[PDB]
C-alpha cells in the first residue's frame, strides 16, 4: 500500500548519495524547467497532423 516505487534499492555497499543529496534543494527547480521544455515539443507533434494541407491523413467510415 505504501512505497510502491521500485529501483530505489542500491547495491547496499556504498551509498554516497549525500553529495547529490545537497542538490535536492535546487534539484526540483532544475528538473521542472526541463519538464516544461519537453511539453512544448509535444504540441509540435500535433502540427504534423494539423495544418493547412490536411496532414492528418485520417478518415472515419462506417462498415456496411
Curated annotation (Swiss-Prot):
Membrane-spanning intervals of the chain: 27-44
Disulphide connectivity of cysteines: none
Keyword Transmembrane helix assigned: yes
GO-annotated biological processes: cellular hyperosmotic salinity response; establishment or maintenance of transmembrane electrochemical gradient; intracellular potassium ion homeostasis; intracellular sodium ion homeostasis; negative regulation of cell population proliferation; positive regulation of sodium ion export across plasma membrane; potassium ion import across plasma membrane; proton transmembrane transport
Tissue: Expressed in the distal convoluted tubule in the kidney. Found on basolateral membranes of nephron epithelial cells.
Record GO terms (molecular function): ATPase activator activity; protein-macromolecule adaptor activity; sodium channel regulator activity
Keyword Ubl conjugation among UniProt keywords: no
Homology family: Belongs to the FXYD family.
Stated name of the protein: Sodium/potassium-transporting ATPase subunit gamma
Amino acid at each position: 500500500l505504501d512505497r510502491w516505487y521500485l529501483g530505489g534499492s542500491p547495491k547496499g555497499d556504498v551509498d554516497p548519495f549525500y553529495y547529490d543529496y545537497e542538490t535536492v534543494r535546487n534539484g526540483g527547480l532544475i528538473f521542472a524547467g526541463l519538464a516544461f521544455i519537453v511539453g512544448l515539443l509535444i504540441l509540435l507533434s500535433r502540427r504534423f497532423r494539423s495544418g493547412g494541407n490536411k496532414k492528418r491523413r485520417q478518415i472515419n467510415e462506417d462498415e456496411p
